[PDB]
Amino acid sequence: IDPNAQLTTAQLQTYGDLSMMEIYRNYHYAFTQQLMGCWNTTNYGGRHTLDNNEMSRIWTSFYTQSLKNIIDAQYRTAEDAEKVNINSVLRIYRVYLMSIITDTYGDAPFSEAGFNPKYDKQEDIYNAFFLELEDAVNKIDPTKDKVTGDLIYAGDVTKWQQLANSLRLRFAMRISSVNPTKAQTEFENALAANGGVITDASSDALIKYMTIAFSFGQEAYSDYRGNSLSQLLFGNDPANNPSYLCSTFFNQLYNSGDPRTFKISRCYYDGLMSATSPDNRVDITQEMIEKGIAFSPRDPGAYSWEPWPTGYDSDICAELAVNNPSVTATMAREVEPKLANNFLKSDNPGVVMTSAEVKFLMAEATVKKWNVGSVSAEDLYKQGVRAAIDFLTDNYGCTATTDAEFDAFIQDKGAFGHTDNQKLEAINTQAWILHFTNPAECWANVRRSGYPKLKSPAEYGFGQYLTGGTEIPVRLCYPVLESSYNKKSYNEAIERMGGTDNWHSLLWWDTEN
Ligand SMILES: OC[C@H]1O[C@@H](O[C@H]2[C@H](O)[C@@H](O)[C@H](O[C@H]3[C@H](O)[C@@H](O)[C@H](O[C@H]4[C@H](O)[C@@H](O)[C@H](O[C@H]5[C@H](O)[C@@H](O)[C@H](O)O[C@@H]5CO)O[C@@H]4CO)O[C@@H]3CO)O[C@@H]2CO)[C@H](O)[C@@H](O)[C@@H]1O
Ligand SMILES: [Mg+2]
């Protein structure tokens, strides 16, 4: 009933729902070519398997829970002067959750959602995002009702203005190909709105999750207290099918001399690792470097087992073997980079939006000749990269990158370009690294900006397996069951796309493939 508790639940579900996070490991992480090799990632997204049920998870999870609850809470709270803050916060978080739906699937229920709700055109949903965030920002008033269930900003309603105006930046940059004039105007208005935007890391929008032991039992699916994305990236089958990194991502980090290379990824021997927890793994990364062993990250479409890499004999593992000889010294699949333990904790925050992103958005707007302030595009980009690197230090307990290590990176392969194209590539490639823990935003921004320039699994010699088509999908399909619950509205949506629900159909804001 209570709208403040409704907000809590909505925030927890965003990364707490173990059912929903399957979609990100199956599809998003493969489409963005950040992870590859894990059976689920490779089979589904890596090889373009059309599976309606796997594609439906965001739609179902939100319309039956968070978004339904929030819409209700907003409606009960709407026209109350004495409840104007909780109202405005709900409106802002409603917009965010809706942004995930429309960015996955195209046209969708918004205005009439919460008996046979229309599928609002994506254009008009985005129209509503700006209007909603602008009104919410203007209604916030810290003298009125206080917010009690807020796991992002603990009720700091000033920081909600910063988030709202920051989301305005994000959505304005999103529509900057389809509708440049509106994009510019909405971006410049957002900078001038009450509260401003997120100018530094202390106003980062992060959902606070607790430490609960990972469980894949039935009771676990109703428990959103933990970060279930991190739970899943550890794995239901963690020894055989862990989060192996994709070569596009690992090679970007490694070949650019990126300081985060061995903060995001390690090579681990997992023979002695427990199920349930990433404890007792054996880090062989430094050993591999010292001995000159090639890393073998997984090309798009590849499993961990094919191609089966040349390895080496680990002296560390040979040491372990004398005391308990069920350990192999001979490494094979372990030379394949995996996601570092820092990113496999239920502690991990739920990333909504960061100061690092705002910097990249500011840099891009500057490159596009918008009127955004007096700071240079290059400086904005540099601040963005610094913030994205420090994001790991502050939130995932990674090692600090020294001023010297940063300066060496930024003056060489991390450098802002000179050409507009080069600058856009740099900003958006770097933003792609930042968004690793925000898959929803990572896939949207990859599709929108066109960077990094990803190649289809077909180009890596896996065309023979690309069951659902050759090109990397650019959306996910509506759940089949919408055909019977919401037929008229469902059929109208599909008539706009050409009469088929195709996952190669470009979303309205996506102009190029
Ligand atoms: O065969 C070649 C290759 O296989 C590898 O092993 C694979 C195997 O082939 C796959 O079939 C197997 O697939 C499992 C998925 O990994 C796993 O994610 C999924 O988990 C299910 C769970 O079992 C199910 O109960 C759960 O139901 C919940 C619903 O999702 C919720 O909506 C509902 O509210 O609550 C229920 C719970 O009551 O859903 C999850 C998914 O969300 O199960 C799949 C089928 O078993 O994966 C194997 C690897 O893990 C092998 O490793 C290779 O070596 C080999 O060459
Ligand atoms: Mg595109």
267: left (phi over 0), alpha (psi -120 to 50) or beta: beta
Quick check: CB of 241 below 6 Å from ligand 1?
A: yes
From CA 136, how far away is CA 130, in angstroms rounded? 10
Ligand 2 centroid to Cα of residue 472, in Å, is 10
Which two three-digit tokens encode residue 472? 């990397």
3-state secondary structure of 109: coil
Dihedral sign of CA atoms 330, 335, 340, 344 in order: negative
Quick check: CB of 237 below 6 Å from ligand 1?
A: yes
Q: Treating both helix axes as pointing N-terminal to C-terminal, what angle do 84-104 and 3-16 enclose, rounded to 10 degrees?
A: 30
Quick check: CB of 460 below 6 Å from ligand 1?
A: no
**How many domains are contained in the chain?**
1
Quick check: CB of 240 below 6 Å from ligand 1?
A: yes
Residue 81 DSSP label: G
CB of 431 within 8 A of CB of 391? Answer: no
Ligand 2 centroid to Cα of residue 250, in Å, is 22
From CA 478, how far away is CA 20, in angstroms rounded? 15
**Would you list the DSSP string of 232-250?**
HHH-SSTTTS--BBBHHHH
From CA 191, how far away is CA 202, in angstroms rounded? 18
Tell me the one-letter amino acid at 65: Q
From CA 131, how far away is CA 335, in angstroms rounded? 50
**Would you list the DSSP string of 211-222?**
------SGGGGG
Q: Which of 29, 39, 59 to mutate to test the pocket of ligand 1 (most atoms within 8 A of CB)?
A: 39
Structural domain harbouring 253? 1-513
User: How many Å is the Cα radius of gyration of the chain?
Assistant: 23
Name the burial class of residue 415, with classes exposed (0-12), middle (13-18) and buried (19+) by CB atoms within 10 angstroms of its CB: middle
Say which residue the tokens 């619950």 belong to: 485
Report which ligand 1 atom has the smallest distance to the Cα of 235.
Answer: 50
Torsion of CA 156, 158, 164, 168, to 10 degrees: -150
Length in residues, the chain: 513
From CA 34, how far away is CA 25, in angstroms rounded? 10
Expressed in Å, this structure's resolution amounts to: 2.4
Nearest CA to ligand 1 atom 38: 218
**Would you list the DSSP string of 252-266?**
HHHHTT-TTHHHHEE
Residue 326 DSSP label: T
Report which ligand 1 atom has the smallest distance to the Cα of 237.
Answer: 50
N-term to C-term CA, the chain: 44
Ligand 1 centroid to Cα of residue 45, in Å, is 15
Nearest CA to ligand 1 atom 31: 19
Distance of CA 283 to the CA centre of its chain: 27
Backbone phi and psi for residue 263, each to the nearest 5 degrees, phi listed first:
-100, -35
Partner residues linked to 265 by β-bridges = 339
Say which residue the tokens 């070569």 belong to: 247
Ligand 2 centroid to Cα of residue 105, in Å, is 15
The verdict on whether omega for the bond into residue 307 sits within 30 degrees of 0, i.e. cis, is: yes
Give the residue from 144, 145, 136, 142 showing the smallest Cα distance to 166: 136
CA-to-CA dists, residue 125 to 57, 182, 217, 456, 502, angstroms = 20, 14, 37, 30, 21
Nearest CA to ligand 1 atom 28: 19
Which two three-digit tokens encode residue 318? 């040979």
CA-to-CA dists, residue 476 to 112, 280, 503, angstroms = 22, 38, 5
Give the residue from 183, 213, 445 showing the smallest Cα distance to 347: 213
Report which ligand 1 atom has the smallest distance to the Cα of 18.
Answer: 42
Which two three-digit tokens encode residue 61? 């999870």
Cβ count within 10 A of residue 469: 14
CB of 166 within 8 A of CB of 356? Answer: no
Q: Which of 237, 306, 333 to mutate to test the pocket of ligand 1 (most atoms within 8 A of CB)?
A: 237
Counting ligands in written order, the one closest to the CA of 508 is 2
Dihedral sign of CA atoms 439, 442, 446, 452 in order: negative
Contacts of 502-506 with C-beta under 8 Å, sequence gap 24+, read 502/477, 503/50, 503/55, 503/468, 503/469, 503/473, 503/474, 503/475, 503/476, 503/477, 504/469, 504/471, 504/473, 504/474, 505/106, 505/474, 505/475, 506/474, 506/475
Tell me the one-letter amino acid at 150: D
Backbone phi and psi for residue 331, each to the nearest 5 degrees, phi listed first:
-95, 140
Which two three-digit tokens encode residue 81? 């002067």
Counting ligands in written order, the one closest to the CA of 215 is 1
